Write a protein that binds this DNA or RNA. Structure first.
Lengths: 121, 97, 129, 216, 25, 206, 48, 87
RNA sequence: AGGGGAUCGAAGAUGAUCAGAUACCGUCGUAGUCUUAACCAUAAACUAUGCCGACUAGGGAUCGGGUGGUGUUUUGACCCACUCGGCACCUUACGAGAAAUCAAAGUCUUUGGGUUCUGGGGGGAGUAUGGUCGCAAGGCUGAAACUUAAAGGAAUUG
């Protein structure tokens, strides 16, 4: 079988969250970085670790992947979390309310721009 | 101990329920306890539908259907894979598959 | 059928207090129920209550507080000599510094410590503590 | 040494909580056995019984040991603890810790006049575990702890001097008799007597008045 | 043995004791 | 008693009815009956917005009582409420728990996610049941946004509101943040509006 | 209530009922029937 | 609880629930104690001051905690029209 | 004891399997099955749970009756809200329990609403004997000598 173990999945995971800018989509280059970036005890393990990392860069190219966050993705994430339209969806584009809803406004004693429409089951 | 709160049947507020006979082994089981299924199938099976349409002396002839209601006793319901042993928590479920 | 209206009244009071409610409705009313509820009241156990007239033995509403632990009746209403109170209280009272046993005498419905003062005894009715 | 890992543990070491009564009064959760013994240094322990227990496997019976422990002050605090471990020494060592985390107070009053110091329970109380039911009634002075050897130790290590006991159910299962006694004696503070009917203002939680110190 | 068939055996035994004794009576 | 300026202002009422915070569930449970105003045909029960606002300020006052702001924890396990919580924890100092609630946050004192708060707020008790249930072991008060049919076991202050609407869930989180900030002096004048639009608290579907 | 009468004038049923139920006891049954004097080899004596 | 000459010989006096007037025991771990902040004239909380309540485990488990706080709050003026006695 | 007697079928007879098969499977087949007149009086006759009364948690569906809605289709049928009386069902544990579980099996060591029936380790034994009922099969009532350290209930790991 070609199922990697957790000592490979996690080692590659650590590399991407700390060295995304320097990795590429190429095995040979990633092979040499893992020598300058991590201390590994064998040629066999080092090949496997780099091989999965290449595979993960391909995934990130097509779209973000659960379980991996890096400085670039988080920065672009927070930028879109500041979004806000020009006019609120709560703001008036013309407010309609049922007959029973209207009665509620009267009891509270607030003056509002009410339009009443019929409603039925 | 008590295995089911319904006693394996559906009798409440009733003294007696008249029985029916299983279709495989011919044994009497009260109506409310028997396992019951409905088997509706086109008379002409799927693999033969093309030949019969080509052979019909009519255009647009709707295939008749066959209806029957089948009664099984517990022993023959287990064997025929109509029902299967089910876990403690999963026994209480009533919703069909 | 209904055998002791007092047994119903104290059962209702006990169940409500046990579950937190702050009031009850006990039906029907009776003289013995009022007299029992006045002894409970006189020591702070219940609080206010009111009697609703309906021409049919009436209802009552009792305002409770968290004090009451258990109120009940002793049936049948056993005869109690004067010197046997010390063996009834020792059976159904949490301790001998608080709690009451209410017994009916010719002097009226009284708690046992008021029966010692007056030197009276009679039938036993219930307890509160 | 000791380094806290909870808010209460930090305050206790820092000295802001000085008596165990604040913890009970506010019903704070205790999850560090060092808190109990920094406030009640006088505790003495006792192992009541040790029994073996076995489960089945393909390769025979897996045997492990069960130990019961009681810790208390003989001045109004007790706890009960049960642990199961592969070795006998470990079961006892871990039992002392579980018992200490469960220290509860007891209420001692008088049987008759309020002369001298308290000597017995304030009211009758009952407790139930399994089928065992332990009931404690007040007794006059000089009665002693009228109870079986196992339950007498727990009451001595609690501070009760004169007390009656009646038990029903299968008492021979010692874990259930001691558990039933433990529940019964802790219920003495749940029972409302007329001398507590007075209304007292709610104290401010210590975890709020010393807020800065708890954080770090 | 099954409770049912033990009951049957005892009954067939009594029926015979009931007729051997009838010779003397 | 609160100053008269705390009453429900017409500007706020426009927000509340616009977001359909006043459209309740088709079923009501007994403990929630006082929050119901009238029953429209078709069975939808209109929630009394007046009691929604009044309860909202009281919840805000309990929040402002806790000294350390990091001891207020906001949970929301469902998508429509996660963004609202992350920004409620931003403007105020509350520690948010967005996404899945790890069993043992409030009970296991060696887990990396151990929080021992003084108040917890939840968006929907039905789906955030693990947080509320654990809140009952360690003496933690609970506040919850409650629909007329939601469970009320181990919940102290219930802010009645529609919890099946995207705009409703967000607006209630937006309003609390405003009131806690005002009570603490962060915002100067209660009269003027706040300069952050409520859409910042809504859920983006893409 | 429970399965017994509680009335003040119910004493007879409690006497007779209990008298009937003492015969389930092994000790009570042997002593009254006096089987010691009939079947015991010693006839109720300590030594023979 | 005092002795023959007035000395309190009780370890401690426990609290009681506001909604039910029952003792809150030591290990009632569902129980809570709420604090409600008072407000100055300018509509700002006054540091360190509260209107305090306690609710027992029983009340909270039955779901009556919400209603019981509405009763107590409205009585103390912390709410106006949330609670009506006639149900 | 009359009548009826198509089906299925204790007994009986046969073919096969088998070491044996006077059993299961295949085909016959009397009594029985059904009705009238008269006996018997039994069952896992079970909800293995006596009857009357009060009180205590939440949610929906259904049967009968009644009230409000001139609701809607063409007060009959439906729809919505309420109520009384039933057959039940879902969730939970304030509570109960040895547990399985239980809205009663709760309101029982904090032990008392009225009342009837039954049990006292396992076998011998529901046996012997004496009565009484039945045409018979049998039903109701029901021991003793002797023997014995365990039988038994619910869950746990294998």
């Amino acid at each position: 079988g070609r199922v990697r173990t957790k000592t490979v999945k996690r080692a590659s995971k650590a590399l991407i969250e700390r060295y995304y800018p320097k990795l590429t989509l190429d095995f040979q280059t990633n092979k040499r970085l893992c020598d300058e970036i991590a201390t590994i005890q064998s040629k066999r393990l080092r090949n496997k670790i780099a091989g999965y990392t290449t595979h993960l860069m391909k995934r990130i190219q097509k779209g973000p992947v659960r379980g991996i966050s890096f400085k670039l993705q988080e920065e672009e994430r927070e930028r879109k979390d500041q979004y806000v339209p020009e006019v609120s969806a709560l703001d008036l584009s013309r407010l309609n309310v049922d007959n029973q809803t209207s009665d509620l406004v009267k009891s509270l004693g607030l003056k509002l721009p009410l339009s009443v429409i019929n409603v039925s089951a | 101990p008590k295995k089911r709160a319904s006693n394996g049947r559906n009798k409440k507020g009733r003294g007696h329920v008249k029985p029916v006979r299983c279709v495989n082994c011919s044994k009497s089981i009260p109506k409310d306890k028997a396992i019951k299924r409905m088997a509706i199938r086109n008379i002409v099976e799927a693999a033969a539908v093309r030949d019969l349409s080509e052979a019909s002396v009519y255009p647009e002839y709707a295939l008749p259907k066959t209806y029957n209601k089948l009664h099984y006793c517990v022993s023959c319901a287990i064997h025929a894979r109509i029902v299967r042993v089910r876990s403690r928590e999963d026994r209480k479920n009533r919703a069909p598959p | 059928t209904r055998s002791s209206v007092l047994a119903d009244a104290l059962n209702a009071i006990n169940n409500a207090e046990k579950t937190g409610k702050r009031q009850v409705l006990i039906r029907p009313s009776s003289k013995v129920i009022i007299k029992f509820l006045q002894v409970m009241q006189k020591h702070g156990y219940i609080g206010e209550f009111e009697y609703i007239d309906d021409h049919r033995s009436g209802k009552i509403v009792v305002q409770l507080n968290g004090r009451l632990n258990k109120c009940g009746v002793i049936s049948p209403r056993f005869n109690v000599k004067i010197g046997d109170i010390e063996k009834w209280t020792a059976n159904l009272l949490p301790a001998r510094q608080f709690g009451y046993v209410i017994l009916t005498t010719s002097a009226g419905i009284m708690d046992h410590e008021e029966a010692r003062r007056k030197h009276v005894s009679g039938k036993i009715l219930g307890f509160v503590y | 040494g000791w380094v806290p890992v909870t808010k209460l543990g930090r305050l206790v070491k820092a000295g802001k909580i000085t008596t165990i009564e604040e913890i009970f009064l506010h019903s704070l959760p205790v999850k560090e056995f060092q808190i109990i013994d920094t406030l009640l240094p006088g505790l003495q322990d006792e192992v009541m019984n040790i029994k073996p227990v076995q489960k089945q496997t393909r390769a025979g019976q897996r045997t492990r040991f069960k130990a019961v422990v009681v810790v208390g002050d003989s001045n109004g605090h007790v706890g009960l603890g049960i642990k199961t471990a592969k070795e006998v020494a470990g079961a006892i060592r871990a039992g002392i810790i579980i018992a200490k985390l469960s220290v509860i107070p007891i209420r001692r009053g008088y049987w008759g006049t309020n002369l001298g110091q308290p000597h017995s329970l304030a009211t009758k109380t009952t407790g139930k575990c399994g089928s065992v039911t332990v009931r404690l009634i007040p007794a006059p002075r000089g009665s002693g702890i009228v109870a079986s050897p196992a339950v007498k130790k727990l009451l001595q290590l609690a501070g009760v001097e004169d007390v009656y006991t009646q038990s029903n159910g299968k008492t021979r299962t010692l874990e259930n008799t001691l558990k039933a006694a433990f529940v019964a004696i802790g219920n003495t503070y749940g029972f409302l007597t007329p001398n507590l009917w007075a209304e007292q203002p709610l104290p401010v939680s210590p975890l709020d008045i010393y807020s800065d110190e708890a954080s770090a | 043995m099954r409770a049912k068939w033990r009951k049957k055996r005892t009954r067939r035994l009594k029926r015979k004791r009931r007729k051997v004794r009838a010779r003397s009576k | 008693s609160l100053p008269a300026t705390f009453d429900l202002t017409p500007e706020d009422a426009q927000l509340l009815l616009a977001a359909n915070t006043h459209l309740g569930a088709r079923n009501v449970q007994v403990h929630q009956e006082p929050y119901v105003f009238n029953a429209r045909p078709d069975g939808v029960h209109v929630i009394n917005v007046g009691k929604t606002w009044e309860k909202l300020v009281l919840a805000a006052r309990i929040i402002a009582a806790i000294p350390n702001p990091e001891d207020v924890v906001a949970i929301s396990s469902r998508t429509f409420g996660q963004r609202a919580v992350l920004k409620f924890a931003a403007h105020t100092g509350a520690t948010p728990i967005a996404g899945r609630f790890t069993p043992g946050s409030f009970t296991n004192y060696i887990t990396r996610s151990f929080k021992e708060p003084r108040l917890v707020i939840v968006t929907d008790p039905r789906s955030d049941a693990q947080a509320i249930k654990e809140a009952s072991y360690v003496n933690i008060p609970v506040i919850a946004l409650t629909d007329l049919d939601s469970p009320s076991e181990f919940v102290d202050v219930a802010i009645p509101c529609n919890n099946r609407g995207k705009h409703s869930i967000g607006l209630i989180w937006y309003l609390l943040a405003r009131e806690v900030l005002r009570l603490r002096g962060a915002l100067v004048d209660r009269t003027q509006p706040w300069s952050i639009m409520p859409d910042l608290y809504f859920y983006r579907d893409p | 209530g429970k399965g017994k009468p509680r009335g003040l004038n119910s004493a007879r049923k409690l006497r007779v009922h209990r008298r009937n139920n003492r015969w389930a006891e092994n000790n009570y049954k042997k002593r009254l029937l006096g089987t010691a004097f009939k079947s015991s080899p010693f006839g109720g004596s300590s030594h023979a | 609880m005092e002795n023959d000459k007035g000395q309190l010989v009780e370890l401690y006096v426990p609290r009681k629930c506001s909604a039910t007037n029952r003792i809150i025991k030591a290990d009632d771990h569902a129980s809570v104690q709420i604090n409600v902040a008072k407000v100055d004239e300018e509509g700002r909380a006054i540091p360190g001051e509260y209107v305090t309540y306690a609710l027992s485990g029983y009340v909270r488990s039955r779901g009556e905690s919400d209603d019981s706080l509405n009763r107590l709050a409205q009585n103390d003026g912390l709410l106006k029209n949330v609670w009506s006695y006639s149900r």
